Design a protein around this ligand. Structure first.
Ligand code: SF4
Ligand SMILES: [Xe]
Ligand SMILES: [Xe]
Ligand SMILES: [Xe]
Ligand SMILES: [Xe]
Ligand SMILES: [Xe]
Ligand SMILES: [Xe]
Ligand SMILES: [Xe]
Ligand SMILES: [Xe]
Ligand SMILES: [Xe]
Ligand SMILES: [Xe]
Ligand SMILES: [Xe]
Ligand SMILES: [Xe]
Ligand SMILES: [Xe]
Length: 553
């Protein structure tokens, strides 16, 4: 196999036998084959749009297909085989539509050679063998490989955010068109300038998509607000919801109301605690445990059903006993875990089985007590603009440190905790995404009532951090967003973090420190381009990085 899309890739070069995440060769190769089929759909979909007869019938299939190949999202080979079969059928329908339109417009049959992604076909018996030759290493030129894979990785992060917006009824034609432009481009031989322009275009589409998801979430469930979240437990059995989808949370809360089953969040569902629509349910207890990578022991000790709405689902350890109470939904899948089917249009998902099972379970084991404060998304922060600006002017807040991003297992991530603990006491950390779990349970206090850690939400709520920065730029009358007293020391793990990074690069942010390591999918020449144009840097020691950031460098 060959996969190198997440921060934990083997040796920082690529996983070749079994993923470090646990992804076996057969699963990795099937994900490559699904992406190959998506490029085929994109070739014809792009041509139909160019001929003036766009077909948007595969929009959701394409977003879900890309999302299913995100790190820790779907482990069920049967799901991938089904998606590949369905994608071949969808591709063929687009091909037949294209051939007729091309002939009508040109007065002759189409006869230009097409990449194999547009024509290869087979039943499911042929998939395992074909998958081995349509992987990442089929691109021989290292620079072309790096630019194509950077684009696809960024694109799958954008697709995830767009799928959440779509679930809530929010969509933009430009996003779905770009999905096919970007996928089809990886089957073409383009110049370096063209390839880099597509990557920057993906960063601009990441801004569009994060803005759309921000609108979707806040219009539907209200603007997040300051909230004190309990991290201890109640006395009833509960259901633990993890991942990012807030519509699944809305339905779970409604279906569990009055049943004697409590609702708890985990990981990236922590920010559901900040929304006014969900704060009205007294049975919504709080947030359980920490970061996604500690879920084996935490899902175990939770004792009740666990619902994964999105990635990060980690394979069970041999001694784990919660497979019979593990539920997947959305693009998530796992062999032997019960899956909650998609909601009918205008209807809801059916969580009754989780509720019936939870009534047979003991209450969660308390793993800690106290609380976490959060809910500092853009509306809430801009509502406190005068207080924030005055603190910056008085010198009470000397600098902001954006430490948003994604957490991971490697020991080198103690750097983020130590940076948080060692930053001067007149600095405020801004965060979003599960990178927050390295420092959101510390006792850093506040600065005149402003918490020293301000959690804006999920990794998509890095959007709010950009809105805040842009507001500060205008208030302070600065010509360049980089001249604000803000430093960026971002942690990454999977592909949604890559989309966030590309969005910040599109917004003109320079000097970002990215880590705990730099991506394996950046070749030496591509990495040099990023350093030349954007001054992206690796992490150094805690002391060196704090000193540099306090100097604005
Ligand atoms: S998702 Fe990450 S750890 Fe898993 S196979 Fe790919 S690069 Fe390796
Ligand atoms: Xe790039
Ligand atoms: Xe604030
Ligand atoms: Xe802020
Ligand atoms: Xe602000
Ligand atoms: Xe990020
Ligand atoms: Xe960010
Ligand atoms: Xe962003
Ligand atoms: Xe920004
Ligand atoms: Xe900011
Ligand atoms: Xe990244
Ligand atoms: Xe990047
Ligand atoms: Xe390059
Ligand atoms: Xe880089």
């Amino acid at each position: 196999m060959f996969c190198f899309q997440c921060q934990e890739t083997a040796k920082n070069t690529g996983c070749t036998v079994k993923g470090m995440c646990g992804k076996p060769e057969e699963t990795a190769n099937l994900q490559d084959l699904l992406i190959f089929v998506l490029r085929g759909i994109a070739i014809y979909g792009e041509k139909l749009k160019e001929l003036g007869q766009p077909d948007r019938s595969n929009d959701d299939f394409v977003l879900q297909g890309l999302f299913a190949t995100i790190t820790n999202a779907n482990w069920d080979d049967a799901r991938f085989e089904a998606m590949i079969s369905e994608g071949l059928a969808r591709r063929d329908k687009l091909r037949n539509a294209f051939l007729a339109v091309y002939k009508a417009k040109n007065g002759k049959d189409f006869s230009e050679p097409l990449p194999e992604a547009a024509t290869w076909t087979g039943d499911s018996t042929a998939f395992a063998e074909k998958a081995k030759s349509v992987g990442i290493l089929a691109t021989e030129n290292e620079d072309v490989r790096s630019l194509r894979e950077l684009l696809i990785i960024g694109l799958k992060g954008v697709a995830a955010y767009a799928e959440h917006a779509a679930v809530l009824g929010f969509r933009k034609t430009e996003i779905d068109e770009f999905m096919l432009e970007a996928l089809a481009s990886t089957t073409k031989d383009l110049s370096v300038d063209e390839m880099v322009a597509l990557v920057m275009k993906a960063g601009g589409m990441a801004v569009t998509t994060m803005a759309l998801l921000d609108e979707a979430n806040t219009t539907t469930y209200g603007n997040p607000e300051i909230t004190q979240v309990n991290i201890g437990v109640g006395k009833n059995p509960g259901i633990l919801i993890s991942g990012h989808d807030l519509k699944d949370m809305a339905e779970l809360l409604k279906q569990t109301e009055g049943t004697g089953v409590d609702v708890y969040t985990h990981g990236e569902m922590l920010p559901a605690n900040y929304y006014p629509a969900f704060k009205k349910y007294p049975h919504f207890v709080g947030n359980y445990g920490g970061s996604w990578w500690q879920q084996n022991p935490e899902f175990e000790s939770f004792n009740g059903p666990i619902l994964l709405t999105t990635n990060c689902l980690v394979p069970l350890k041999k001694e784990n006993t919660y497979l019979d109470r593990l539920y997947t939904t959305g693009v998530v899948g796992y062999e032997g875990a019960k899956h909650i089917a998609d909601r009918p249009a205008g209807g809801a998902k059916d969580f009754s089985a989780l509720i019936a099972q939870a009534k047979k379970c003991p209450p969660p084991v308390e793993i800690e007590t106290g609380s976490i404060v959060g809910g500092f998304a853009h509306h809430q922060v801009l509502a406190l603009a005068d207080k924030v600006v005055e603190a910056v002017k008085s010198g009470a807040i000397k600098r902001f440190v954006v430490m948003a991003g994604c957490d991971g297992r490697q020991k080198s991530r103690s750097y983020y905790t130590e940076v948080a603990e060692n930053l001067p006491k007149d600095t405020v950390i801004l965060t979003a995404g599960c990178a927050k779990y390295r420092y959101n349970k510390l006792n850093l206090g506040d600065i005149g009532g402003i918490p020293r850690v301000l959690d804006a939400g999920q990794c998509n709520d890095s959007y709010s951090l950009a809105v805040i920065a842009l507001k500060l730029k205008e208030v302070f009358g600065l010509d360049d967003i980089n001249d604000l007293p803000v430093s960026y020391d971002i942690a990454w793990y999977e592909q949604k973090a890559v989309a966030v990074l590309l969005a910040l690069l599109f917004l003109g942010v320079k000097g970002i420190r990215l880590g705990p390591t730099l991506p394996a999918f950046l070749s030496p020449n591509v990495a040099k381009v990023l350093v030349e144009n954007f001054n992206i840097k690796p992490i150094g020691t805690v002391q060196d990085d704090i000193a540099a950031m306090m100097a604005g460098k």
